[PDB]
């Protein structure tokens, strides 16, 4: 599913991401925009053989099992395919674990390089929330 901007903001808010660990909703929308272009089905393979999955590009070395990342962990206890669903629940629940792991949203490279320090409230402007 490719979400619209305000549709994704509303879904993220319903699932408790607004101000989660102190990160306002626009941070999460901005991260999704630049990680996946709001597409739940996005995948990207990394040099180390891991793959990033879904709207928040969650990585198989640590967070989910894809059967093809040797020596990896599955700290979200899910198959990586669950992160591609039109229902964002599994991605949000896993992202809550990631953002709690010590480095905050810096775990998402696109957030660090393209959202951090910018006017992220712009990403929720005009939305009925
Ligand atoms: Cl957009
Ligand atoms: Cl933080
Ligand atoms: Na894994």
UniProtKB/Swiss-Prot annotation:
Disulfide bonds join 6-127, 30-115, 64-80, 76-94. Keywords: Allergen, Antimicrobial, Bacteriolytic enzyme, Disulfide bond, Glycosidase, Hydrolase, Secreted, Signal. Its main location: secreted. Its EC number is 3.2.1.17. Residues 1-129 form the C-type lysozyme domain. GO terms for biological process: cell wall macromolecule catabolic process; defense response to bacterium; defense response to Gram-negative bacterium; defense response to Gram-positive bacterium; killing of cells of another organism. It is an enzyme of class 3 (hydrolase). Substrate binds at residue 101. SMART domains: LYZ1. Transmembrane segments: none annotated. It is found in: Secreted. The active site is at 35, 52. It comes from the Eukaryota. GO terms for cellular component: cytoplasm; endoplasmic reticulum; extracellular space. GO terms for molecular function: beta-N-acetylglucosaminidase activity; identical protein binding; lysozyme activity. InterPro entries: Glyco_hydro_22 (IPR001916), Glyco_hydro_22_CS (IPR019799), Glyco_hydro_22_lys (IPR000974), Lysozyme-like_dom_sf (IPR023346). It catalyses: Hydrolysis of (1->4)-beta-linkages between N-acetylmuramic acid and N-acetyl-D-glucosamine residues in a peptidoglycan and between N-acetyl-D-glucosamine residues in chitodextrins. In the egg white and polymorphonuclear leukocytes. SUPFAM superfamilies: Lysozyme-like. Lysozymes have primarily a bacteriolytic function; those in tissues and body fluids are associated with the monocyte-macrophage system and enhance the activity of immunoagents. Has bacteriolytic activity against M.luteus. Lysozyme C is capable of both hydrolysis and transglycosylation; it also shows a slight esterase activity. It acts rapidly on both peptide-substituted and unsubstituted peptidoglycan, and slowly on chitin oligosaccharides. Monomer. Belongs to the glycosyl hydrolase 22 family. This is Lysozyme C.
């Amino acid at each position: 599913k490719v979400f619209g901007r305000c549709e994704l903001a509303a879904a993220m808010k319903r699932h408790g991401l607004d101000n989660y660990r102190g990160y306002s909703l626009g941070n999460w929308v901005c991260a999704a925009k630049f990680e996946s272009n709001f597409n739940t089905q996005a995948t990207n393979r990394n040099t180390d053989g891991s793959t990033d999955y879904g709207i928040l590009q969650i990585n198989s070395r640590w967070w989910c099992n894809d059967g093809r990342t040797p020596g990896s962990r599955n700290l979200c206890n899910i198959p990586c395919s669950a992160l591609l669903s039109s229902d964002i629940t599994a991605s949000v629940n896993c992202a809550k674990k990631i953002v709690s792991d010590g480095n905050g949203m810096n775990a998402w490279v696109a957030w660090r390089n393209r959202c951090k320090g910018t006017d992220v409230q712009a990403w929720i402007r005009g939305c009925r929330l």
